[PDB]
Amino acid sequence: GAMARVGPKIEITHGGKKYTVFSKVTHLVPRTENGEEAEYVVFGPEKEGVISVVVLAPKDLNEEALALRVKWFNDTKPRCVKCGAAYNGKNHFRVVAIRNGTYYLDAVCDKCEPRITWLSAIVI
Amino acid sequence: GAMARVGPKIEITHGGKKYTVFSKVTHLVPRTENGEEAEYVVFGPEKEGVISVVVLAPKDLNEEALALRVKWFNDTKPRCVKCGAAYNGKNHFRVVAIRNGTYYLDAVCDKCEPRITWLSAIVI
Ligand SMILES: [Zn+2]
Ligand SMILES: [Zn+2]
Ligand SMILES: [Zn+2]
Ligand SMILES: [Zn+2]
Ligand SMILES: [Zn+2]
Ligand SMILES: [Zn+2]
Ligand SMILES: [Zn+2]
């Protein structure tokens, strides 16, 4: 009976809030014309005290690296590119990031992009 | 009965020689620390008048783009990084390239790296 890791990688508190962070190694991610492969991060609405996070990336990200994505997002507070809304805990919100997670190419909410909810649902 | 494209994408003559170029869209390729995803190109030995080429890349490359890889290789004549040998038509030879195929990170021959022959054999 060989074990298998399942569910969230790490659970963290930050800014008085609790984040359950899932991740998947996938290359089904956006890329620049130049050839830099991006990552998706999707933030879910707070449900039962906890905000679900899903990081889809082409590389294996350790727990420190995963925790830093939440921090960078919380401290950047990026706005939806289509409507200007920030993640408020009631919506889903997706960023596309390159440069080892530090540079956002895109940010969008699920009222402007409903499909982002199916993205994280597949992992969650 | 739905058709399916098979075998080589393009066959080209250059420098008095004939190249049969295969390709595969794959993300099982090398990458830089920064996040630039590379491509493999493997040159086979001339057998029955023809040199087999196999381009493994994370993007869909049209026939012009595939033909340019052969040209850039023929005109660069890069040397094996481990022994200094050039592709001579008798050996297999692999380059790793980024920057839309123009910049070689690595070049190696199959006496120094025997596994490169299994790389192209899977596609061929
Ligand atoms: Zn803080
Ligand atoms: Zn990839
Ligand atoms: Zn929006
Ligand atoms: Zn939602
Ligand atoms: Zn020429
Ligand atoms: Zn060599
Ligand atoms: Zn060989």
Chain A: residue whose CA lies nearest to B57? A35
A·B CB contacts under 8 A = 31
Mutation target among A26, A28, A37, A60 for the B interface, most CBs of B within 10 A = A37
Distances (CA, A) of A90 to A55, A87, A95, B95, B96: 19, 8, 16, 50, 46
Q: Is there a contact between A58 and B27 if contact means CB atoms under 8 Å apart?
A: yes
- B31 neighbourhood in chain A, CB within 8 Å: 37, 58-59
B109 touches chain A (CB under 8 A): no
Report the C-alpha gap between A40 and A3 in whole angstroms: 28
Phi-psi category of residue B116: left, alpha or beta, with phi > 0 → left and psi -120 to 50 → alpha: alpha
With CB atoms and an 8 Å threshold, state whether B34 touches A99. Answer: yes
Three-class DSSP category at B64? helix
Using a CB–CB cutoff of 8 Å, tell me whether A30 touches chain B: no
Does domain B10-124 correspond to CATH entry 3.30.470.40? yes
- What letter would DSSP give residue A31? B
- Can you spell out the DSSP letters for A55-67? EEESS---HHHHH
Q: How far is CA B3 from the centre of its chain?
A: 26
List Cβ neighbours of A122 (8 Å cut-off, separation of 6 or more).
Answer: none
- Domain spans of chain B, in order of start: 10-124
Which of A11, A39, A35 shows the shortest CA–CA distance to A25?
A39
Q: Is A27 annotated as a binding residue?
A: yes
**Cα–chain-centroid distance for residue A70?**
8
Full strand arrangement of the beta sheet holding A50-57: A10-14, A17-25, A50-57, A39-43, A93-98, A103-109
Residue A94 forms beta bridges with which residues?
A42, A108
The single-letter code of the amino acid at A37 is E
Nearest CA to A107 among A33, A22, A40, A21? A40
Give the DSSP letter of residue A101: T
Residue A93 is encoded by which pair of tokens?
Answer: 């919100």
Give the mutation candidate from A26, A31, A33, A103 for the B interface (greatest B CB count, under 10 A): A31
CA angle B81, B9, B16 (to 5 degrees): 65
Q: Are A89 and A97 in contact (CB under 8 A)?
A: no
Q: Which of B20, B32, B101, B25 is nearest to B56 (CA)?
A: B25
Resolution of the structure in the document, Å: 2.0
E strand or H helix at A119: helix A116-123
Determine contact: A34 vs chain B, CB below 8 A. yes
SS3 A40: strand
